[PDB]
Amino acid sequence: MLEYSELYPIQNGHRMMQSLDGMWKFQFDPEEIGEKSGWENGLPAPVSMPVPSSFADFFTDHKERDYCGDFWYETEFYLPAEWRNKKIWLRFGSITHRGTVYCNGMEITSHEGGFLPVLADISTVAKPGQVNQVVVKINNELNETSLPCGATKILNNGRKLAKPYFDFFNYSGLQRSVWVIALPEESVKDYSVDYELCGTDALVKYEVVTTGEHPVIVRLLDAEGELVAETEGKEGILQVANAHLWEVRNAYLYQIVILITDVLDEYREKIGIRTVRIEGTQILLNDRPVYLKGFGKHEDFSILGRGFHWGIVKRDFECLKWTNANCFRTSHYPYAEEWYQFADEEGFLIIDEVPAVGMMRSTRNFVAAGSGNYTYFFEALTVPELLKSHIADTEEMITRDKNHPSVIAWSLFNEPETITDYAYEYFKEVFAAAETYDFQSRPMTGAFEKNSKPELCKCYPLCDFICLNRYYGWYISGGPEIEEAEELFRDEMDRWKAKELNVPFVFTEFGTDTMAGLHKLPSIMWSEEYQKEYLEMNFRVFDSYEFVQGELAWNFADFQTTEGIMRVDGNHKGVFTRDRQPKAAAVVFKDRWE
Amino acid sequence: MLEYSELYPIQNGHRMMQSLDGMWKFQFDPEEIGEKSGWENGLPAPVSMPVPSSFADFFTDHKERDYCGDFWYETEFYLPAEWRNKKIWLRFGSITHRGTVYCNGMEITSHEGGFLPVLADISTVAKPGQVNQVVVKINNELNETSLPCGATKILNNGRKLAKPYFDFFNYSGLQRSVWVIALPEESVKDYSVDYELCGTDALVKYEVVTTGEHPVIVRLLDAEGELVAETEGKEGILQVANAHLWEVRNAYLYQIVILITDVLDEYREKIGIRTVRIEGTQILLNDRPVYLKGFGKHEDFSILGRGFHWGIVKRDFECLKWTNANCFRTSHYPYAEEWYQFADEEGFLIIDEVPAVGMMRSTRNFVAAGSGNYTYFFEALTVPELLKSHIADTEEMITRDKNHPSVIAWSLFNEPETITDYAYEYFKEVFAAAETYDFQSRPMTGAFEKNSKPELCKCYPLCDFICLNRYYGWYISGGPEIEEAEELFRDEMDRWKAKELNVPFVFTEFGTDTMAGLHKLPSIMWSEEYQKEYLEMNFRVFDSYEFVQGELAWNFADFQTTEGIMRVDGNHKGVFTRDRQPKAAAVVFKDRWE
């Protein structure tokens, strides 16, 4: 279990917080001489770099956009003098992909994983009342011992080029907000809630972790601040009579309030009373079935790359609502915590995905996810280091996101090898670990490439429901062969039906690249009309199987990828353009999903 | 030698001609029951179809655009009564890809090859003074015994889908003009001219073929109609003193006049006195070196497909002149005869290409032309039938085009297998046959894919000069690897240099797909800026080798291809858009080629 708290920062009497967002100093370190040359003390010749954002798309030259290797940030903040006697942490929403944090010259901690928060305890070096310095050494290379997976090519000048095993640009930097926070010396470290429904009434079971021994009181407030339940102890049950349940696209948020007393700490968070259970082939939310309708997405916008902005969230949610979606998948990595906060208010359902993408050794991975070629990926001697990373990223993800009502499943892989017992052994461990970290035991899943065929795949028995990525009519029998493609699709769904697994299937990826404004009569692959015809055919197949309980189309919006001959300025399978405007097919979803 | 004349039709006393262009009747024959059901007599339920044009892009539904198999045309013309006693032929500029011609109910002839004229002698069935009927059964399937090569997929309904081994849409139909012509019973069938330069003076050596025994007189007129030479005999030498030579981008056309006498026939054609010789690594035109600057092209325009229109020629030549080009390659098939006629007036140099494309078994042939995978193509038992077709298409091409001054080389293959003695044996025969059909023995060549490596290729010793297709910085080390690509290019050109072959090299294909209006700073593959950077780098490499004597960039204009995931509405490697407007890179050529 973890040496820090994953809880979002708040500001009350006992807990303080100050934003470090703004313009930082930035400098590339291509010869990797920073540590030995005093950069922990300040950067020798930096530039200005916005935070949060991704560094790549600001520059005007290739070597800098495509930089791969070591690079540094530095900034300076004044701590209020009133934060003596408090524990003081730096909280980075993310450090992509790995980094060591230095503060006032001292190395505080290093982290691996570029999509989950990083906590640095600077209590012993922070100078309250004075100006303080923070310096972060970051690395954005890809390998097969960390997620997401890939490789690093050295070119003739010795400069490094990222060669990912995934299909999305390797944005990196400090992409999410950065805080400095003050906690009490005895503090709430973690807590977990589970829900039971008793007719109209409800139980909120909870457990609490603290950095101390003092008694804990837990209060639960309704939307208007009035009290509805109170229990003493670090373990308890809250009784909410005539409970107001969090519903799909109709949220109700209670407020939990955790206290440590003699009052030493207070933590407050919005939660939603709802239950998630798989009965047979159905997904039950509050004991009634739900059908998932929505999109795979990316944290991706012009200029900012993966940088968080609230304006992107607002628009992306006003578009999801306009299509009448109810659900999205945080593909292929946990998002910024603000996305889940807002999903909670709006009643969207989230499949939360750990970044286990790239577990097949292929640099053009999307044509290759149906080629039939096994890459011997889980037979290699780096696999134990990889497994340790994957489990640690699952643990940090679940701890961070488990108390959001919108999060209803965990996706623990996208398009890996599953056709050999080497991969069963691997994934069995991962699921085992995820089952222990989630106090609610909500459904665990992953998304399968076409190569994980019903006859050969070893891993679908680990899944509570099964997610399929399928491109019938695009990478398989596309264009004039599109009727062959429908058959082949039905052929496979027939074989899955024949297995009588009695579990739900969700299509988590299907789509066509579509250039906005390419019209052709008759339609051709890449036009707007072909996208509509494609979707109308996948819909017919989905609607032919009682156990298909969900469609998450790929993608919500055009996004940026590694450049290559099959990628025309990124990936054009969006239903919206990258500036968040709808292609002709968005209307297809809107109508179907009403 | 051939049972018909390849000479363009003219109209004088002795030779008459009438156009059949207009709206014809058209009908698909998917069950292939036309012959047995009386369609030779008239079509049972036809539609209207323009001639010349390609049928595919008129329709609004897939099954008809993508039709593959048998299909029929029919029209009706009145012959003047005055054409009794004349021999009467139908002349189709083309019938793509194969066809049997019926006239007034009788089968006249069938043809194989879809890019060269088809002559049908209807003398014995034509009814002068009445209305006559012509009916053509056509087939547009692809195989490995005819050119260009491919395959035919049967889908689940039994309908056929063309699966070409080449990268261009399988347009088909009656794509060029169609005449009915009247000849004298004793007529000029063929003639050939060769040129010698004697200081300021010149010799036009000629031979003539007739369908008879009567004496032949040959006259040569200058631009203004005045006489400059006369010789009796079917074999002769014309002495032109103070000759006016056809020059690059500065043409002079004399007029040859062939007569049969007692006067029984007259044939007239414009020719240009010029010489083509390869001395060492130089291409000499009129004994001085020339550097080829221009484009590979296609017969390709919106709506019309491969249909000929003079307006396309005019605009395409006003664009070539604007880029300061001097040369193009009729890739990948002989064009309509009007293109060469106009090249003669404008002084452009032409590499004339027989349609020997597809001689490697691959349906995504352009990523595969550098993959390294041999397809065992010339070891197969269809190869002798294929060779017979290729030689017959070379023979018909050369006979048709040999007397154009603009035609200065023959390309006899594009991107075939060359790395085994199976293919040497094949191509040795082809060159042997082409050498016999060309009275001027002008240079013979072909274009090589990257897979025909210097160490392995068996076929470059047959070539008078060597043509290379290379995509360094696009299908090989493109994008951020573009400096690796330059090296690799130089590595190969170094190996060719080391072979000290002392022959000229012409790059006949290099380019990048470029979406008009995609700008990015820094540039990415597919943008307009990347095209410029690509070209500026290939130019540096070309300019580093004394023996590179030509650059023909691919392509002059965006054109239509089989639809697929790597083709965004056709092929975007044009320097012009398909509507004949310039991308940013066209200006690069303009400046370099002044």
Ligand SMILES: [Cl-]
């Ligand atoms: Cl640059």
Ligand SMILES: [Cl-]
């Ligand atoms: Cl249709």
